[PDB]
Amino acid sequence: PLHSIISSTESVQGSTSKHEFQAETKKLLDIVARSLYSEKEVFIRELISNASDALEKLRHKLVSDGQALPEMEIHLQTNAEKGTITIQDTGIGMTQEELVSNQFGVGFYSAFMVADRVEVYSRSAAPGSLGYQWLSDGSGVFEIAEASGVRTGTKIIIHLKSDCKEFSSEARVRDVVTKYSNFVSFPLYLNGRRMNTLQAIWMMDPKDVREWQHEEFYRYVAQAHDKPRYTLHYKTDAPLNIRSIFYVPDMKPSVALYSRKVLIQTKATDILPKWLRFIRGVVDSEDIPLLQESALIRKLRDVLQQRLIKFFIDQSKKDAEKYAKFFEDYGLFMREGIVTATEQEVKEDIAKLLRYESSALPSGQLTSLSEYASRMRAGTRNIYYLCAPNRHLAEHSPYYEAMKKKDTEVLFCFEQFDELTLLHLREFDKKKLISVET
Numbered sequence: 001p002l003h004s005i006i007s008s009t010e011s012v013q014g015s016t017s018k019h020e021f022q023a024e025t026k027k028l029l030d031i032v033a034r035s036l037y038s039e040k041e042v043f044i045r046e047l048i049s050n051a052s053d054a055l056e057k058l059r060h061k062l063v064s065d066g067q068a069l070p071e072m073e074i075h076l077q078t079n080a081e082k083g084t085i086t087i088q089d090t091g092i093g094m095t096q097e098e099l100v101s102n103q104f105g106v107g108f109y110s111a112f113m114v115a116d117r118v119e120v121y122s123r124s125a126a127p128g129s130l131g132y133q134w135l136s137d138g139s140g141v142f143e144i145a146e147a148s149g150v151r152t153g154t155k156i157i158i159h160l161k162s163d164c165k166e167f168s169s170e171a172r173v174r175d176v177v178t179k180y181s182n183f184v185s186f187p188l189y190l191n192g193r194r195m196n197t198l199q200a201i202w203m204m205d206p207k208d209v210r211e212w213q214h215e216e217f218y219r220y221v222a223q224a225h226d227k228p229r230y231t232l233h234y235k236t237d238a239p240l241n242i243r244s245i246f247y248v249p250d251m252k253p254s255v256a257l258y259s260r261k262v263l264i265q266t267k268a269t270d271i272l273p274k275w276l277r278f279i280r281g282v283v284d285s286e287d288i289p290l291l292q293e294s295a296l297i298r299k300l301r302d303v304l305q306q307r308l309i310k311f312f313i314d315q316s317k318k319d320a321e322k323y324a325k326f327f328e329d330y331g332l333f334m335r336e337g338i339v340t341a342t343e344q345e346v347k348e349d350i351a352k353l354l355r356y357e358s359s360a361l362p363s364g365q366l367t368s369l370s371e372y373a374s375r376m377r378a379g380t381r382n383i384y385y386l387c388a389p390n391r392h393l394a395e396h397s398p399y400y401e402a403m404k405k406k407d408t409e410v411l412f413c414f415e416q417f418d419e420l421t422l423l424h425l426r427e428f429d430k431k432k433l434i435s436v437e438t
């Protein structure tokens with residue numbers, strides 16, 4: 001089962017031509033190498049991500065041209081003996097000009113975060129392409145030379161710093177891979193061992209994913225053994241770029257942040273409003289660059305809050321008995337969110353999820369503030385509710401019994417935390433929330 005492709009096949013016949021980065025390239029290299037990423041280990045993530053993109057570009061090209069498909073793989077090799085770590089892909093490679101002038105991303109230069117020297121071999125996939133070697137110690141000077149024995153694609157050999165030797169031990173590198181790159185779109189091997197088995201199902205067409213995949217992934221992200229009660233597969237480009245799946249556990253009572261199938265933060269606590277912290281799943285967006293995550297993250301937070309509210313509302317429409325169970329189990333969060341919200345309009349959005357018993361309905365079945373209001377006739381600026389220990393006492397309440405042959409229907413709350421929520425909300429839509437007993 002041991003499968004490796006990394007070996008010394010490369011040789012350079014002539015001497016190298018020395019180049020020197022410009023004022024820009026000098027700033028870039030310095031900032032990315034020590035000022036940009038907080039943890040140094042993410043260089044593995046960036047290079048893996050680069051290798052994936054190059055693999056994709058070649059595959060799309062061959063498939064577009066109708067050509068057959070070669071081995072499309074990503075390989076990592078650690079050498080603690082030589083203090084090196086190497087990553088090779090068999091993707092679309094690089095031309096001489098690209099090796100010289102170079103938006104695949106900076107991500108490649110993140111290597112100088114842990115290396116005092118980087119040695120590169122690349123060969124373009126286009127027929128008759130030549131291979132080239134690229135050398136650099138990161139001092140703004142790099143060398144270029146035509147190389148033979150270069151396989152199509154790109155091979156990066158990192159000569160690790162004295163105190164970065166940890167990334168030459170397989171055990172350390174394996175952990176880094178499984179942490180950040182477990183959903184990589186192409187086969188990934190480490191010292192010949194296959195490492196990635198999980199599929200990024202959030203990138204799929206939602207109507208192609210089936211139940212068992214959503215169950216598997218839910219159990220992964222939520223580290224859970226039950227099943228998702230609710231599943232929302234949300235994809236969008238207009239507001240921002242968004243690839244995401246949200247789950248509500250079957251069980252009674254966080255979301256991962258990804259970008260292009262690579263992990264940014266396992267606990268994206270700021271991605272959703274605090275009251276939606278019961279939601280499990282993943283958010284993938286190309287729009288994200290630590291303790292301070294908030295920036296335009298908020299814009300995404302607001303997008304997701306609105307999409308989730310509409311989701312649960314739509315759920316209410318199609319299924320009321322299931323949603324009534326959901327409201328029973330998770331109402332707490334909605335109430336917390338309503339009392340927490342600063343803007344009134346946000347309060348009323350979340351409040352659209354609340355369900356209460358009504359006087360004009362059989363005891364047991366619930367209604368929403370909107371549903372109550374629609375039937376309201378010749379009624380201005382009022383929503384009437386009564387809080388009692390139970391439906392029995394609510395109906396037999398003289399306060400309500402007054403509304404018996406009178407104008408309006410009356411909502412029934414049986415818990416004090418529901419009444420306080422209405423009091424706090426004050427007005428909803430065109431109407432003010434008012435207690436029968438004053």
Ligand SMILES: Nc1nc(Cl)c2cnn(Cc3cc4c(cc3Br)OCO4)c2n1
Nearest residue numbers: 050051054092093102104108120134154
């Ligand atoms: N794996 C892979 N495949 C391809 Cl097609 C490309 C294209 N750019 N890069 C990153 C990169 C690598 C370099 C470099 C500048 C950059 Br930007 O100078 C030395 O090597 C790639 N990496």
